[PDB]
Symmetry: C3
Subunit: 655 residues, 3 copies
């Protein structure tokens, strides 16, 4: 309010914006840059992001800021605020930027870069945020480079591990993975402290990326310590490999939930969305439709995003991504993608109060993932790629539950287990899904026992709890979840990729992936299959209940490309209060999503139809009459039945 | 101290997996259930890691505990020498890393053998777990120095006697001698401290690693030969429905290597792959019964399952176990127990099993595998890939199995070429692409003295130096009474259409044409000569230079190869040996004797009830073992899917 | 005898010489070579098989072969092939070290001084198969040369306008390094022999064309050669289109040759056993097809790898035209019919000049270099992988072949841009993604002066520094009378449906949209602008920035690309050149002249007898060559599957 001063500082009450990367490199003319900022302003965008390339400021000897001065001044002229990304000198062929210093000497070059860049550009009144580093984290961390190798050595010296647990069993300690967490914590914190030596006024921001693979690098609760907002790159062509294109709605929803969870009390925004065409770039190349641009912006805003920034407004000109990713065409005019984005910027300025106070309507369903399940999976599958026996099953399982709930029109959180609040006295009508979270330790099992005792519903499928955080299987040594599950594993038997669990009663069938789990119940009620084996159980535990099915049924739904049975089963296990209080679909709808939110007391719903046909969606739960506030293809409703067209995005206001 | 022999009572057993953290109570629970499951024997990994103390001294307590509980339940122990190695190293190191490491191994053996040789229930030392690896450590100083010394003591020339360039396969020949040296050195280290107990070793992945293994030399220092034969690691060349054939070939191969020594299968898959294995499965109860009967019918003195109980941490945690997570019997342990019980109820029959040799020997040689590796430059699938020289003879083996005929599967050096008479004996050389002068003389002698030789694919195209006498002057012209003309590459699967009877053989990849001098030509519908029969002294040679064994494999149909092979067999083999009246897809039979009494093992791997008409030998069928109530009407056996049957001929 | 554009063409074959061969077998080869109407052999002058322990040269092994060649009146192409590993099939491409360069100097002095004295020596082949994908940047000699080259070339990280650039230092050095080594080899030979022709065989040209500066090579060669092997070099095609592959390979070498005569130094003579990437045994019909395609494209020779086979390890008993009894395969009998046709038609065959339609398909080094940086080395002939910049122009080439129209296939620097008139000439730039200002000026000049320019795919998207003027200010806007708007990635295969209902073109991967200023827009059925025709001086430009050549390739249907290209050709090309009345799938025709008389080569690669209606040029069809009794009725040719036909126009 004072310490704020002129620089307008982001909060959970900020007006959301649409924006775009403005790509600055030498060779551009004043005239082409002005043309970009002018069209950006006319497209109802308030914000740009700029890579502050060290390469294009370093002179043969000193820093020359001219190239970026030119751009900041044209941004200021058009009333555009700047997210400035700290991007020290690196090879021209290094698209994403280095993730850690190479050497002590290189660290001092980074220090010097930050001093020069932040001292100079902090003086512009249109600077909105410092992005500490572009896209922290990579798959291939540089353990070979002297700086990282020395840090890992020091870290090992200051952490005593034993090769055995308290009971005497051999263990893995995951020194590499735990160091990598602390190393990201250290470098992003050090970058924040370097900026703070020269600028205590402007927001600090960072964009974690490829989150369905790199979530095991990321300690979001620690990052809150030094950030003012959490960001993200969520690119259809890089990050959504686990989904088909028609489910990029579900991918963006999960990516948004994951960042929102990491953000905690901090506001968040999507620092990068795909603005344009892959020519040679991308793993899953596309040119987003106008319809996809609208879908992604609404999903993010409905999940509390304070912003959506497109990579990129204008294109790079040379080598990697030359003439790729751009919202503008090669004549510097609007693609149908920029026209679509402009409709959302316009909607915000016409609905300022609604859009500035969005709070996601939490159903009370939390889908939890943990670092340690991903780390144990990596050691056990020895890095096969693909499937339960490959890297990524521990994320594809909970993502399948997420998709099943989306196709039921139910919100679900997607959270790292440490982001879940286990300290409350009541969990009546809260639900935790642990889908193939193969690593759980004593400490987390106590937290789950507490959650269920106090009224929580726990749903557990696949190999959840098979290992502890040291890759020791208590299924072998003495099962640590026996008390909570009221039951004990007997066998896993590997089967085909896709098989059927045929229950005894009602001739009822679940698709299952790869392994058939059998159990023995003590306190739990057994559920039997047609072969007279016990495949699942319900344990009443204090005020709560546990549903345990040790076959992977989430992955079975994914393998069968049919979430209808997982939807019906999950719905049947939910507390009545979730279904009565939350808008959802009367039944499962393939390739439709709904998520609901509130803004100052008023409830809203976001609906997207990704199927090939017009759908009539019967919305039940909550209260109110449906009023269509946003629809890009003439959706209509009759009572609470919404008729929605293929690729249409709809916002309903509940009157 | 009890020494194993060819008269020993066979046993069923299982690995007992010992690591710190286990309680006295859980270990006793394992040995008690093992004894109740009619198992006599366990195997224990004597981990150096779990005996070495901070100061480098040895503490034996963890393994004392296990040996004492074994002793209490009258269970004998196969103790595997397994020096300290990384916790993540599942299989163990195959050679010392350095001279310093060799001295650590010396010290480990002194301590472990001096101590555990004193237990009365010790049955055998396993010298090393699973000798041999695909990736031999030529980078490590110890191996690199030994290879250098070996090359200096072997004078090789770049040219042969005729002047032609040669390859000398220094790496491959050194690797043979290096395995010989390390296993012999381990045996001598044990013998410094214990001259009383059997020495054993378990070669593994034999359809790929047979080129590492000189079994005749190993006989000089072993009391028994072992094997790991795991459905999930070693049978990639087969589908699951033919793991009967895979296990039969694996058993034959070890039996051949064993020679005069007794053999047993040191490891069979006891349980489920979660994350482990190349071809993951959970064996059925029916497969456990099938594997034990195939091994015993092939003279195995034992079958040990990996594993009774599971590892607890990281690789294979809660995997491979015969017991469930409550330490009770899976259907697999219940099945194994039926076989241990059958043994104790039929001691004399089961203690004296001798495989009924049909007289058919399918031979493979190291050098064909070595030349194939140089020529295919390591492509992976197929005739143009690593493994065709093993898949070809395995296809003949499968064709004979589906005819109910036993076949040996032997390295060429394990075949006895010194006899005076080979009337009614048959050698199959199926795509054995490397043969030298010395072995061709032995084959000439074998055929002259009455032997039948069947040769298909590129058998004999190269010598042991990768020199093709097909180009320079064909070394098999004399024996074959014929000369190759050309190979022409075709599709992966094509048909050889013979002139006579419009009859059709599946063939893989290459069509061979020949010219006969002394041999009788066999012509195709295009007027080209594709095969011949050469009368040579008392014997005959059938040569078809197209790969017809691999053609059967590629077509998943061994029926034509069955009919053709049967047509070529001496009448005595068909009259004296029980076999099928015709080819049966996915059925196997192998016969054995115990004292004068003849038995047959039949397994149906098809999806339907089969009626198998058994002809040859003498006697009337009495069904002695049948886990699904097979019945016979005269010598026609009605056998259910997955059923194992033992017939006694009365 | 020095070779010229008037030389009598020959059929010939490698005579493979190594120690261990006998006088008798070598004489047998030369005698059968002479009886097969071959005049020429090629011999690898292995340094390994001449060097003695003391370092002196013993020429005996090669004297024997040269003397037997001389006795049978066979001339020799002698390949300079210094000492190298026995396992090195192709030979080293550059010296390893300064010390190694001196060994090469010494090898050339000895071999050229001695063998230049034989009267039957026709040519020195300076090096076998210059170029490889994996250049040895780690070896001292190459590493020193690259360092020196970089020191003598000043590059900046920015262009004149200030934009970041790539400079392709590695690719530009590799061009100059090949230029240097081949020129140095030529000068080393010339120290000892100024009398005999210098020759070299570039290989795998559809991948390695980016290594090869043929205009520079002309300064030191008397003839350009080539290896064009069906099993190594034609991966971008199916076997039924190896007609088109050989035609393109011949056109590419002919273009490289410029004023020099050319011949194909290596064609596949025989069977792949274990060797080759796309293994085959050429048919007799394919041998005839390849010889006629090459001679119709002005080849002065076809030499088969190989007459006889290597004996040891790699390619032992592979590639040979003779069988293992040293008699003729159907391949050698087929080749012999063409050597006989030559001696019976000496005047016609000695003066062949390809009938240039006026269509030139151009590729450039820089499009291949830019593609390699942008695709970061992804694999196949898909737009997002290495090789799309060659598969695109090859697809236009195939579409024209299936219309019976000749097309040149030329590096852009081999096209003569200096003429005053280009009326009735056509340049096709199909996905040539890199064009600089200098070449665009040359194209402006070509169109102004009457040229037709056809451009598809991402032609012109980048300059030679991987900078996209599509982004910064489009360098082809002036010539194209239009500007790119967007590329939008689609499926592998999609349809461009013109608003006219004229055309439904298959298109690959990317849909390009444009905005016309001067050009006439062409709209699709979705109302987007996908192509244009710009009148520019006397000439015209057809621009369609979607890849329709790659779309034809992906759809395996060139019919629409044929129809569209034909509709854009100057009337004069269709009236003056024999071509098909319409597109024929899997038929090719190419025409040539010999002193004023016109001929056409037709090959049917379809599964069925075709009746091909030939229109354009003048005259009545007379069948001069047909291997399967083709007939014509007026100008309709009835031609059998795999049949090669030569028509003489009367
Ligand atoms: O790949 C498109 C963009 C994704 N991430 C961004 O930070 C940029 O580095 C890339 O060019
Ligand atoms: O993979 C299962 C077992 C196979 N080989 C054995 O010797 C053990 O090392 C393994 O754990
Ligand atoms: O592979 C066949 C031949 C192709 N290129 C030739 O120069 C030889 O090196 C080969 O043996
Ligand atoms: Cl940035
Ligand atoms: Cl062991
Ligand atoms: Cl040569």
């Amino acid at each position: 309010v004072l310490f704020q001063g002129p620089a307008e500082r982001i909060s959970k009450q900020s007006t959301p914006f649409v924006g775009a990367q403005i790509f600055i490199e030498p060779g551009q003319t004043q005239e082409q840059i002005e043309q970009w900022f002018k069209l950006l302003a006319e497209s109802n965008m308030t914000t740009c992001r700029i890579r502050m390339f060290g390469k294009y400021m370093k002179t043969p000897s000193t820093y020359d800021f001219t190239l970026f001065d030119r751009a900041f001044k044209l941004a200021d002229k058009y009333h555009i605020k700047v997210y400035a990304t700290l991007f020290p000198d690196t090879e021209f062929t290094d698209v994403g930027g280095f993730k850690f210093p190479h050497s002590r000497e290189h660290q001092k070059e980074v220090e010097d870069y930050i001093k020069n860049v932040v001292s100079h550009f902090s003086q512009y009144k249109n600077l909105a945020a410092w992005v500490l580093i572009n896209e922290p984290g990579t798959p291939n961390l540089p353990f070979n480079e002297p700086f990282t190798k020395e840090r890992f050595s020091d870290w090992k010296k200051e952490h005593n591990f034993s090769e055995y647990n308290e009971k005497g069993y051999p263990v893995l300690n995951f020194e590499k993975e735990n160091f990598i967490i602390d190393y990201h914590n250290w470098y992003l914190n050090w970058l924040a402290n370097q900026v703070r030596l020269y600028d205590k006024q402007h927001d600090l921001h960072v964009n974690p990326h490829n989150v369905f693979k790199l979530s095991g690098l990321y300690d979001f609760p620690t990052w809150r310590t030094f950030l003012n907002s959490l960001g993200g790159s969520a690119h259809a062509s890089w990050h959504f490999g686990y989904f088909p294109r028609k489910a990029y709605t579900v991918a963006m929803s999960a990516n948004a939930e994951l960042i929102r969870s990491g953000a905690g009390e901090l506001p968040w925004l999507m620092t990068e969305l795909q603005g344009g065409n892959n020519l040679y770039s991308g793993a899953n190349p596309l040119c987003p439709t106008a319809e996809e641009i609208i879908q992604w912006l609404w999903i993010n805003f409905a999940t509390e995003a304070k912003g959506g920034i497109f990579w990129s407004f204008n294109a790079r000109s040379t080598a990697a991504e030359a003439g790729e990713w751009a919202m503008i065409n090669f004549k510097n005019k609007s693609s149908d993608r920029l026209i679509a984005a402009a409709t959302i910027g316009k909607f915000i300025t016409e609905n300022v109060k609604m859009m500035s106070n969005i709070k996601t309507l939490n159903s009370g369903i939390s889908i939890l993932y943990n670092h340690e399940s991903m780390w144990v999976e990596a050691a056990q599958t020895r890095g096969k790629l693909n499937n339960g026996r490959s890297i990524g099953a521990v994320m594809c399982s909970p993502l399948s539950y997420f998709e099943a709930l989306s196709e039921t029109g139910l919100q679900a959180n997607f959270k790292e287990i440490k982001e879940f609040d286990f300290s409350l006295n009541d969990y009546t009508d809260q639900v935790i899904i642990l889908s193939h979270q193969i690593a759980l330790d004593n400490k987390v099992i106590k937290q789950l026992e507490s959650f269920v005792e106090k009224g929580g519903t726990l749903i557990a499928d696949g190999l959840t709890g098979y290992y502890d955080y040291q890759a020791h299987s208590t299924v072998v040594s003495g099962f640590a979840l026996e008390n909570l599950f009221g039951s004990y594993p007997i066998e896993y038997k590997i089967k085909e990729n896709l098989f059927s669990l045929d229950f005894e009663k009602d001739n009822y069938k679940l698709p299952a992936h790869l392994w058939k789990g059998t159990i023995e119940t003590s306190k739990a009620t057994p559920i039997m299959d047609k072969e007279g084996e016990c495949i699942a159980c319900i344990n009443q535990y204090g005020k709560g209940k546990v549903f345990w099915i040790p076959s992977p049924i989430a992955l079975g739904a994914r393998e069968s490309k049919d979430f209808s049975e997982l939807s019906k089963l999950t719905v049947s296990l939910l507390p009545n209060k979730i279904l009565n209080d939350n808008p959802h679909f009367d039944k499962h709808y393939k390739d439709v999503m709904m998520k609901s939110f509130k803004s100052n007391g008023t409830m809203y719903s976001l609906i997207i139809n990704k199927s090939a046909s017009v759908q009539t969606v019967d919305i039940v739960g909550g209260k109110g009459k449906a009023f269509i506030l946003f629809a890009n293809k003439n959706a209509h409703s009759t009572a609470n039945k919404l008729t929605i067209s293929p690729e249409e995005t709809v916002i309903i206001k509940w009157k």
